[PDB]
Amino acid sequence: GTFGETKKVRIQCYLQLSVSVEDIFKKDIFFFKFLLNSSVREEPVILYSS
Amino acid sequence: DEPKVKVGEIINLKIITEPTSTCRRKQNSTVNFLDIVIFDSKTSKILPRSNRRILY
């Protein structure tokens, strides 16, 4: 009876990145502006691709 | 490259940096920071959010 019970893990619920959207209108073309930052102001984020 | 750009050309800018003979001076900072700033030809100080302008 392999009991691996009571692994008392604590998990966090805070999405660390934060994305702000800005829709620049233009004639026959379009532009998206994207402000990306961290959730809280002591945990910095690295980014790899978008 | 090619300074006649119409509207829709995402074009890379190339910067070549070389530290001088005063590379011997400081050396306790190992990183320095390079703000690229944007001026109009006639007027000055384009704000860095920069809509209807260069987007980066």
UniProtKB/Swiss-Prot annotation, chain A:
Disulfide bonds: none annotated. It comes from Saccharomyces cerevisiae (strain ATCC 204508 / S288c). The lineage of its organism: Eukaryota, Fungi, Dikarya, Ascomycota, Saccharomycotina. The chain holds residues 753 to 802 of 1102 of the full protein. It comes from the Eukaryota. This is Trafficking protein particle complex II-specific subunit 130. Part of the multisubunit TRAPP (transport protein particle) II complex composed of BET3, BET5, TRS20, TRS23, TRS31, TRS33, TRS65, TRS120 and TRS130. Interacts with YPT31 and YPT32. Belongs to the TMEM1 family. Specific subunit of the TRAPP II complex, a highly conserved vesicle tethering complex that functions in the late Golgi as a guanine nucleotide exchange factor (GEF) for the Golgi YPT1 GTPase. TRS130 plays a role in the YPT GEF activity of TRAPP II in concert with the two other TRAPP II-specific subunits TRS65 and TRS120. Required for both the cytoplasm-to-vacuole targeting (Cvt) pathway and starvation-induced autophagy through its role in ATG8 and ATG9 trafficking. Present with 432 molecules/cell in log phase SD medium. It is found in: Golgi apparatus.
Curated annotation (Swiss-Prot), chain B:
Coiled coil: none annotated. Transmembrane segments: none annotated. It is found in: Golgi apparatus, cis-Golgi network. Part of the multisubunit TRAPP (transport protein particle) II complex composed of BET3, BET5, TRS20, TRS23, TRS31, TRS33, TRS65, TRS120 and TRS130. Interacts directly with TRS65. Present with 259 molecules/cell in log phase SD medium. Specific subunit of the TRAPP II complex, a highly conserved vesicle tethering complex that functions in the late Golgi as a guanine nucleotide exchanger (GEF) for the Golgi YPT1 GTPase. TRS120 plays a role in the YPT GEF activity of TRAPP II in concert with the two other TRAPP II-specific subunits TRS65 and TRS130. Belongs to the TRS120 family. This is Trafficking protein particle complex II-specific subunit 120. The chain holds residues 1178 to 1233 of 1289 of the full protein.
